[PDB]
Amino acid sequence: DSFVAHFREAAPYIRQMRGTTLVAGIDGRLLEGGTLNKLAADIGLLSQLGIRLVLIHGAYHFLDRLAAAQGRTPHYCRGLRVTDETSLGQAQQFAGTVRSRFEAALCGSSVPLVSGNFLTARPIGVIDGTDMEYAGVIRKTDTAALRFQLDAGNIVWMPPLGHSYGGKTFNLDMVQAAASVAVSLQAEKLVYLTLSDGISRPDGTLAETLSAQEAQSLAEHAASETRRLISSAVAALEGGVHRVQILNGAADGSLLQELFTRNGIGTSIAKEAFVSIRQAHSGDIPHIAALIRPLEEQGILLHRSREYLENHISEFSILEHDGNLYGCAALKTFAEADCGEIACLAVSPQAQDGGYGERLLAHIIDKARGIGISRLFALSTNTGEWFAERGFQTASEDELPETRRKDYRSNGRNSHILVRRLHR
Amino acid sequence: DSFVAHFREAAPYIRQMRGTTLVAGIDGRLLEGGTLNKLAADIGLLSQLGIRLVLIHGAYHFLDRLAAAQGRTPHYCRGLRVTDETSLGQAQQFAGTVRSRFEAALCGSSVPLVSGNFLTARPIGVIDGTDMEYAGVIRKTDTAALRFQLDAGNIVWMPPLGHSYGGKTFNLDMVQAAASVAVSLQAEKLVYLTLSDGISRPDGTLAETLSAQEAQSLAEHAASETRRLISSAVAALEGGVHRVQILNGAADGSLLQELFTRNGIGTSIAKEAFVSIRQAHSGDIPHIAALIRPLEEQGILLHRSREYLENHISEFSILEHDGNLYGCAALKTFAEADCGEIACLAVSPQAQDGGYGERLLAHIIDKARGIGISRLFALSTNTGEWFAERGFQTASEDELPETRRKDYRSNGRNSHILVRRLHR
Amino acid sequence: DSFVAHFREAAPYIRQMRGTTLVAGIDGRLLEGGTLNKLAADIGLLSQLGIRLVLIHGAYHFLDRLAAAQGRTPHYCRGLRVTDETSLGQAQQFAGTVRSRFEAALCGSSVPLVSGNFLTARPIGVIDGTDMEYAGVIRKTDTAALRFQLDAGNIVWMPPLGHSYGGKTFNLDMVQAAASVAVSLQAEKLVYLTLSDGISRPDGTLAETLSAQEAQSLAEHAASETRRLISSAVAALEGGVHRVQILNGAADGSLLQELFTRNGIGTSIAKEAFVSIRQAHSGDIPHIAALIRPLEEQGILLHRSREYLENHISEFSILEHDGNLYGCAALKTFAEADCGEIACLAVSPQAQDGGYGERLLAHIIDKARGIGISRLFALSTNTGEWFAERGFQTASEDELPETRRKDYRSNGRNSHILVRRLHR
Amino acid sequence: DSFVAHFREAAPYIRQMRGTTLVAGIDGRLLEGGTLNKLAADIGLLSQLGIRLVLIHGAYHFLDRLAAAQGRTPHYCRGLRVTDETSLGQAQQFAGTVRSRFEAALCGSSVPLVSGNFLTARPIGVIDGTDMEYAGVIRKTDTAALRFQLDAGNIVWMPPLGHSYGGKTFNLDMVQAAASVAVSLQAEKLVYLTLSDGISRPDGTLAETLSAQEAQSLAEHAASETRRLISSAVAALEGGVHRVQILNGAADGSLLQELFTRNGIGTSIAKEAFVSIRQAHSGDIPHIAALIRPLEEQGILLHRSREYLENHISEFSILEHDGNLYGCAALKTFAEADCGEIACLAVSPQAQDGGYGERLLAHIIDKARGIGISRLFALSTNTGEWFAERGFQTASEDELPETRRKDYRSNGRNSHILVRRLHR
């Protein structure tokens, strides 16, 4: 395609990403070849786009290309490397090699890059009778010092090394470290730059987009490395990171493609928040009435009635949290088998703006599609934009199902009519 | 002595040092033993005293304990190490070992420590037909980024490594690098932490305090290493650093002793600014008269006269810059061979507050001492504090030389009389 | 001792004190002699160490050296001086004498000193049928204006005088005023600079360190002046000040000695927060089990069992607040009468980091010492640092009590073993 | 008049005064009666109007009501009070009485008031054989600390007391002190609040407004007190203060009346900057031509000619600084004896915007009025607003002098015509 077209395509993603925090967990093998040069350039570009950037790299594989290729075997109790004094010292050497390399590649492809004593570590201790030695986990992260650097526009570079109150240095696991730092920062995004195209489905295909539940159910039959990825990704989400992404940092330009295109390569994982929505039953009616009545009083919701609701309760859905009712919505059907109507949509005023409405509309379109409905109408006197911004197109009265058209005419309400087309 | 006494002794030096910038050039051998632990603690303390701190270390000796002890000989065209790709890579490893070590020693003896891509380097090129390879000299220092970190209270850590626009890393000479960074920052103080007690005199004794001229004349007969120290120290001073100090960072606690005691160990070098002061001659008189006359009009300076000055010109000194006269002072003598008087002290109003006065008083006490005078009087109607703050003690009229006592009585001026005791 | 040694001794206290707020309540007799010069110097030094400083002085004794020595007797309903218009006016004169004196002593031993209209006062009214006249108590303190000055580095000087909405000035009690200002600032430290070596015990000895409970029980048999000191000190602590100290500002250098040495002269008072820890009984077991079980599931705590706990309940302690259980710990004993083991230490995750653990360990060492135990072991797979940072030294398996050594061998857990030596 | 009218009258002066610095030198007798209450209220109001306020008071008269009324006579070598240790101590007492009084009066008529160690003093020494003792003059003012307080909105209160490096306090002369502080701040305004209606003319009348030259020539025959006022006022102006005002702080509301009405009570002194304007002669013509020619080329200035100028040189004025010509303007006359025209007005582009034009117009209206002209025309193609904003009203062609009307018609230029009426 054309430059202008590509750039106008990127523009909304640039808008979304600007001023947000991205923690990048970087596989240490990427900092070794000329994939390094490609990466510094793309990270330099991200810097230039107003993205706050914290980069953390791994060391394990480099240590093994020093260990294994020597006559010493690494031990990996839960993927956590046992790391002795000699391995610890190598990691310190590698971390300096790598930060220097990155800095040089960034200077030749002027972007401020900073590193500091941000992590305080503790040893993992003893996993399964096996002393883990210098394998440490982040005990405290200096969030104030980090924010202060990101705020000034600095790129933050972190090795997989933390120090302790006992004046020791510990070896950190990168995959776990990035997710920990990401949660501490409440980073909007965690990115793992791996050697893999992302997480694959049981049928072999690349999982473009996953819920944390979907991710979780895949780990049941997944290799060790990818199980740990998921575990860290899920804990990040649960800890407040908005989105976790898995990419192949060996695929030239994949970071740009992931962040700035609708399509995006790799795997994207996000947490589905908890909103129990269920078929309404008999006992819901007073809760539904109390919610609906103010609105029916205001001329926003059509007048219902204890009897209407009792005899049509099956067409209502209700949204609940801790026994508390907070929303409702009905699916009305017609002689036209293809047609449905979202009716009686309502969120308690105290619970609004937090997405509850959208979840009710979604649940009802799932229900509508479940029964063969490809066309979903909404009629509203005062609330038409909400629908128009969520996939509804203006429609005319002559377009309604015949019986609805008749109610509409005799109403006098002249409500706006919108239709959304539901895919098979 | 007692704690309270020691601490009250330190207090003025703490006051002087607070909020000032100190660049520490650190010999790489100090970061190797438990002298490291001692150093982090003392630097941590300096941090806590509101000193802005930039630390730079060397690598040469570590590289040789890797080179020489391998079967490769280092070459040192002007003390500048030829550094190939393999040596460059080692320096990157060492710099990571050392920054990690320092960070750990600082954490266990919470003080924010930061490092960044502050230096951009260029290669030295070819010294004397000898390709110097990866030996680079600082081309640009990011002074804004540095100030921003020091201002926030961060300790700044720098390796002896700069990068270039060509995406290469270069090996920097520490002694030269610190002096360059120090000038860029206009640091009040540069400290070299060496393995030596400082700079020695021709008679073998430690030069406690040196002018840059004194330092310069010592290099004539000095070993190579100490010649380079001086050269860098002198260029720092000439470049605006206020004071350069040389210490043995192997002498436990020497950094504290140097910064916070009157005595201070090690060598201190400062630049004597240019103030040509000479015996007045015949042709000076109009310049002297024009200066003196306003003051004599105001009742601050005793009335002189073209004839007085013509017949006493030999007792005047004058301070000049670019042919321009800016100050004068006279030495009056008495029948009491031990007694002198500083007379007719005056700095042009446009040239005041810049130390000119003090240099005139000093020059005259040097002249007074040259002729056997151990007691120097100053009489002033309005300017008595200036003398009292520069070593003069209140005296009485009955204490004057006899003939001066007589002039004083018949004057009516009742000027304050102060005496300073001049040492033999 | 040596300078370096003294200064390295001070360094941790300098670190702790930097950027903290200290409110100094100063007896007015200290501002009268050359103890004034000593004090300005030490307060100047504290300024230079990044301590935020609010100074308040008293006036009572000066007023009496004007009253009593005139033919007027002061009346002191609860140590609160009745203060008429004539006494009020003297206090205004004294406050100006004293602020000028202090300012001059500070300038000659450049440190910014500021004072302002920070206190608004109200009269105390009528104590016990006795009109108290111009004796006022702080009604409002301008905390924003105060913070603004401390933040800029200014020393804050306050007289014992507040003004009112009725355009009157009132006489404040210093001891009460400092404690009020200290609470308003949530100052980490309140210091009273008195003419006494601090608070004495019933046996005559100087109470180096007191809890607020200890302070309280001393007042039962204490002189009036010291009763009021305690009362104000205790209310400061209860109001959020971290530590209150009582010193003799007539003992040359005592402020430095108190703030910057382990030993410290004078009396230190701190509030013991509320943590009810008691012998576990039968009914605690479900609460203990629920806490312990997650941890035993994770391989951090040895598997217990409803029966184990039922038959060993006497060796458990539990920490509770509002009936809620938040922590537990057991003392295990051995055939070696000198040996104990802290077992089953656990704080609810929701209640962690707030010191609960430390209080459980302390309680158990108190229990261990109560039965003759001088050696206390801790064995931990993942939690060994916590112990090592709280006085435990690494030990070997051959060092365990014999039966514990046997369990340890057959476990397979390879837990780290640490010992703490308990003093008699 | 009406409130709305008064307030709309004040509005431009409020606009001018907002964010400006005013140093108020306050006679110590004003802080003694209920003139104090009036003053705090008016100063409180000024605070509320965004005026940055530095207040300094005197003490002399209070000291004499303590001296003279005791049996000790004050000595006043140049109006500078000899002040011994006993007088110095009284001044410290008075300064505290007075600051407390002011603070209380300000609180009861919430406005932040701050004072600090801003002045460092030196003794005056010996005037005329007379030791002046504790009479000190400001040696250094802490301008940074002062700006920092004014910037935060604080009112700054200063006593007439400075301290020295020798740990002494000195007695400052208020009149001199305010003018010194005012210059240090480059205050736009210095106000002296005296017991007099301002400076009187030789004919007895109150000098409403004076140049510094006018002020200077009045001192020739003026009382001592008013001579010193002038001397300080003039040195303030010369030192960069924009305006000095003298008022009676005993005239209820005079500070408001001076600052916020066109009329304003009291005396106002301002420095006439140096702009030598003289009759042009023969040798000026090339300088005039070079200036005029660019403009005549642009169609802004009517074409002149070496001959025109040679034969009309007497009607030109020229503005010069250091021999350099920077402006010119001509006065054209007509058969109508009442009519004049400002012709050929021009300032060198490099010297514009600095008031030169206005001074040329003024000089020519002075010349026009000197010969009986009450009507002054300006004709301009592109520059008509400049005139309209400096007192010119639009006029028509039928309104020109007859011969000018004829030139105007045949020109084709259609320049805008404006007239200013010159008062007799």
Ligand SMILES: CC(C)(COP(=O)(O)OP(=O)(O)OC[C@H]1O[C@@H](n2cnc3c(N)ncnc32)[C@H](O)[C@@H]1OP(=O)(O)O)[C@H](O)C(=O)NCCC(=O)NCCS
């Ligand atoms: C429209 C409604 C159901 C939305 O419920 P919700 O819980 O807020 O749903 P969401 O949080 O997913 O959507 C919230 C967004 O919808 C927008 N919105 C709400 N009412 C709107 C309206 N009347 N017109 C346009 N937009 C509206 C909100 O302003 C909010 O904007 P934001 O994305 O810029 O923050 C609303 O809460 C409601 O119940 N209104 C009265 C009942 C009603 O009108 N029902 C049905 C319409 S026929």
Ligand SMILES: CC(C)(COP(=O)(O)OP(=O)(O)OC[C@H]1O[C@@H](n2cnc3c(N)ncnc32)[C@H](O)[C@@H]1OP(=O)(O)O)[C@H](O)C(=O)NCCC(=O)NCCS
């Ligand atoms: C006193 C004088 C000679 C100082 O010359 P100088 O070039 O300023 O000398 P320095 O720069 O070394 O000293 C400057 C310091 O002296 C201080 N000083 C100057 N005059 C002073 C005085 N009259 N009283 C007290 N201190 C004074 C300045 O304020 C300045 O203070 P700082 O250290 O706080 O900045 C002054 O310039 C002068 O010539 N005054 C008139 C002549 C006179 O009085 N001569 C002789 C005295 S008998």
Ligand SMILES: CC(C)(COP(=O)(O)OP(=O)(O)OC[C@H]1O[C@@H](n2cnc3c(N)ncnc32)[C@H](O)[C@@H]1OP(=O)(O)O)[C@H](O)C(=O)NCCC(=O)NCCS
């Ligand atoms: C170790 C434990 C008992 C501490 O309880 P607590 O209520 O937090 O006790 P305190 O608040 O007095 O101590 C808190 C400090 O201990 C530190 N700490 C906690 N776990 C640690 C560990 N595993 N390793 C090192 N330090 C640790 C905390 O990080 C905190 O650090 P800070 O001083 O830097 O803030 C922890 O709460 C716990 O119960 N962990 C699981 C149970 C366990 O391991 N029990 C016994 C060990 S055999």
Ligand SMILES: CC(C)(COP(=O)(O)OP(=O)(O)OC[C@H]1O[C@@H](n2cnc3c(N)ncnc32)[C@H](O)[C@@H]1OP(=O)(O)O)[C@H](O)C(=O)NCCC(=O)NCCS
């Ligand atoms: C008009 C002129 C003589 C003003 O001289 P000057 O030295 O700037 O005079 P002042 O400094 O007293 O007045 C400066 C103010 O006049 C304003 N001014 C200048 N030219 C102006 C114009 N053409 N229209 C409106 N206002 C103008 C300036 O913008 C400045 O504005 P400020 O008060 O908002 O800063 C101008 O310099 C000049 O010589 N212009 C070309 C010659 C010309 O037009 N001459 C005569 C007019 S027939």
Ligand SMILES: N[C@@H](CCC(=O)O)C(=O)O
């Ligand atoms: N959508 C509203 C009715 C609005 C209308 O039909 O005008 C409801 O379901 O009650």
Ligand SMILES: N[C@@H](CCC(=O)O)C(=O)O
């Ligand atoms: N020191 C001044 C004279 C002052 C005096 O003697 O009173 C001078 O040398 O002229």
Ligand SMILES: N[C@@H](CCC(=O)O)C(=O)O
């Ligand atoms: N301290 C743990 C046991 C850990 C171990 O012995 O390895 C407990 O008391 O249960």
Ligand SMILES: N[C@@H](CCC(=O)O)C(=O)O
């Ligand atoms: N005022 C201009 C002439 C402009 C005009 O008359 O149009 C001059 O004096 O030359």
